[model samples]
Target chain A: MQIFVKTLTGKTITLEVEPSDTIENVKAKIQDKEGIPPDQQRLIFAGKQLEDGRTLSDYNIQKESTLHLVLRLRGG
Target chain B: PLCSLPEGVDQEVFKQLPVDIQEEILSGKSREKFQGKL
Candidate 1:
C-alpha cells in the first residue's frame, strides 16, 4: 500500500509500505530518505500519535493515508 | 506565573514534544492565564 507522509516543513512524500509494517519501519524509511533519525521522528495519524510497536494496519491505515512527521526536541 | 520555556523553544519545537508533555505545558499556560484574571 502507498502512504503519504507530510513532514513538519510541509514536504510530503509518497512511499510504498506493507500493512503489516510497524511504525518503526516507516520511520526508518523516512530517516533514509529525509535524513531524520528514527528517534527524532514523531509520526501522527488521524490526530493520534503512532506507536512504534503497532502495525500500520492496527491503525486502519489505508492506501493514500496521510501521516504527519514532526521532529523531536530536547529541552535545552 | 508564566511558564518559562527555554530559549529557542518555538511552535515547531513545542509540537515535537510528547502529547502529554504538550498538554501539560498548555495546561500550565492556561492556569497562568486564569491566575492573572484573579
Candidate 2:
C-alpha cells in the first residue's frame, strides 16, 4: 500500500509500505531519508500520537493513507 | 455500500453581540507571550 510521508521540512515523500510496518519504523525510515535524528521526530495524526510500535492494521489505517510528521516544538 | 464525506470546520455562537460588535469580537487584541507561569 502507498503511504504519504510529510516531513517537518515541508517535503512529501510517498512510499509503498506493508500493513505490518509500525509508525516507529516509518519514522526511522523518514529520519534516514531526511537526515534527521529519530529522537527529534513527533507525529500527530487523527488528533493523537502516531505513536511508536503501532501497526497500520492495528489502527485500521488503510492503503493509500497519509500521515503527518512534525518536529515537536515545546513552548513555555 | 461504502461512502465518503469531506471534513469541515465547526462553529458556534458566543454571547449575543451586534454585527459591528461581532466584527469587534473577531478582532482580538492582547497578544501575550508565555514566560513560564509561576
Candidate 3:
C-alpha cells in the first residue's frame, strides 16, 4: 500500500508502506526526505496523532491514505 | 496576540499554508504563554 504525506508546506510525498510498518518507520523516511528530525515530526491521520509504536494497520490506515505532517517546535 | 486557525479553516487548508507561516502560527500561541510565566 502507498501512503501520501502532505507537509505543512503543501508538498506531498508518496511512500510505499505495509500494514506492519510502524509510524516510526514512516517518520524516519520523512526525516530523510524533509531533513526534519523524527522527533520533531508529528504525523496526524483522521484528526488523531499517530503513535510511533503503532503499526499502520493498528490505526486502520489504508492504501492511499493521506497523513498530515506537522513540525513541532520548542516552547519559548 | 497569538495566532490560531480561523473559525472554519480545516486541516486541509491549514496544511496548505507555507511551512514558515504554519510554524509561526503554531509556535506563536505557545511562545506567548511561555513568556507570560516569567
Candidate 3 on A1-76: residue-level lDDT in tens? 9888886555687878888899888888877777767656778787667889899999889999888776555444
Q: Looking at every candidate separately, what fraction of the true A–B Cα contacts under 8 Å does it contain?
A: 0.00, 0.02, 0.14
Candidate 1 global CA lDDT score: 0.65
Q: Which ten residues in a row have the lowest lDDT in candidate 2 chain A?
A: A67-76
Q: Which stretches of candidate 2 lie over 4 Å from their true place?
A: A73-76, B1-38
Q: 1 or 2, which is superior by DockQ?
A: 1
Q: Which pairs clash inside model 3? A: none
Model 2 score (lDDT): 0.49
Tens digit of per-residue lDDT, candidate 1, span B1-38: 12544223345545654565466444433221113222
Candidate 1 per-residue lDDT, tens place, A1-76, comes to 8887876445677778889998888888887777776656678786678888899999888889877766554221
Chain B: TM-scores of all predictions:
0.44, 0.30, 0.39
lDDT of 2 by residue, A1-76 (tens): 8777654234566666778988777677766676545555555455345678688677666776656554433321
Write down the TM-score of every candidate: 0.64, 0.54, 0.68
- Candidate 3 Cα errors over 4 Å, as ranges: B1-11, B15-24, B27-38
Sort by DockQ, best first: what order? Answer: 3, 1, 2
How much of the true contact map at the interface does candidate 2 reproduce, as a fraction? 0.02
Q: What lDDT is reached at residue B26 by model 2?
A: 38
Q: Rank the candidates by lDDT, best first.
A: 3, 1, 2
